[PDB]
Design a protein around this ligand. Structure first.
Ligand SMILES: C[S@@+](CC[C@H](N)C(=O)[O-])C[C@H]1O[C@@H](n2cnc3c(N)ncnc32)[C@H](O)[C@@H]1O
Ligand code: NA
Length: 282
């Protein structure tokens, strides 16, 4: 198989799993039927990441940055806006062609482009090449395997290494070699005195939660934790589990647990003991 996370998110949203008025402006809705455990897995993934982000936002009082590496058609910028939880600046990185596609959608959809300009210092946006830079939001076409390019393009969109900064790689690191991803993680740690990293990945051949923790600790992070997605699903608020479990009928074969045990959410911090960053959990 090979899956597009943003199509699957659009699908789960359509059934009611979580609130996202924005994703429909990026991608079409499939009319297939899906095994509902897939939707539950997506809900757990998005809820886990989101609880971690909001924890970070709370500790930093939003005086911070978020850099989402390999963001795709993520809608989180627009969701945080609506919740009044925006960071000082929000950055996205993806391949240039993935970025062009995202920019074309923002250009064609005032429900996407109005909020960006509202928070912008001008009434117009320059969408030259494969970058959109504005006051609170930037989408940057770059290759995550070229760390010096990555850093140059970020800094020229006003990424400030003095601000606490949260970086997210949500199903991205698998697309690069272990050396390349280790180098990304290391760069991320080296560039900020105060920082958090969130990594959501499949637990492949040979990997384990402990190797996931060590992958971060050995690349310059000072704290790390990791849970498999079934532990996380099991720890979801009972009101949310109740809400999402009555959306679709699930048969009696306990295949949710088969699916989720192969995914993990890991997060690490560096500095900001003053901020209580090492205390953040999902
Ligand atoms: C599996 S998708 C996940 C998208 C998004 N984070 C989500 O979870 O909905 C991975 C994304 O990583 C991007 N990606 C993979 N390797 C990359 C690279 N070397 N440089 C820039 N982006 C990359 C892909 O283009 C794709 O948009
Ligand atoms: Na490209």
């Amino acid at each position: 198989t090979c899956e597009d996370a943003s199509l699957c998110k659009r699908f789960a949203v359509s059934i009611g799993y979580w609130h996202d008025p924005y994703i429909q402006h990026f991608v079409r809705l499939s009319k297939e039927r899906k095994a509902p455990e897939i939707n539950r897995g997506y809900f757990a993934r998005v809820h886990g990441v989101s609880q971690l982000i909001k924890a970070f936002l709370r500790k930093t009082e939003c005086h911070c940055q978020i850099v989402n590496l390999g963001a795709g058609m993520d809608t989180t910028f627009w969701r945080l806006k609506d919740e009044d939880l925006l960071p000082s600046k929000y950055f996205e990185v993806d391949f240039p062609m993935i970025v062009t596609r995202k920019l074309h959608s923002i250009k064609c959809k005032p429900p996407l482009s109005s909020p960006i300009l509202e928070l912008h210092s001008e009434d117009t946006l320059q969408m030259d090449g494969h970058i959109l830079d504005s006051k609170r939001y930037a989408v940057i076409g770059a290759d995550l395997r070229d760390l010096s390019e990555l850093e140059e393009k970020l800094k020229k969109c006003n990424m400030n290494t003095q601000l606490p900064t949260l970086l997210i790689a949500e199903c991205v690191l698998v697309y690069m070699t272990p050396e390349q991803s280790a180098n990304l993680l290391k760069w991320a740690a080296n560039s900020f005195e105060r920082a958090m990293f969130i990594n959501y990945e499949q637990v492949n051949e040979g990997k384990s939660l402990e190797s996931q923790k060590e992958r971060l600790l050995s690349n310059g992070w000072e704290t790390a934790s990791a849970v498999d997605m079934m532990e996380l699903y099991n720890r979801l608020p009972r009101a949310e589990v109740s809400r999402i479990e009555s959306l679709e009928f699930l048969d009696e074969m306990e295949l949710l647990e088969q699916l989720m045990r192969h995914y993990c959410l890991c997060w690490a911090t560096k500095g900001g003991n003053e901020l209580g960053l090492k205390e953040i959990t999902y």
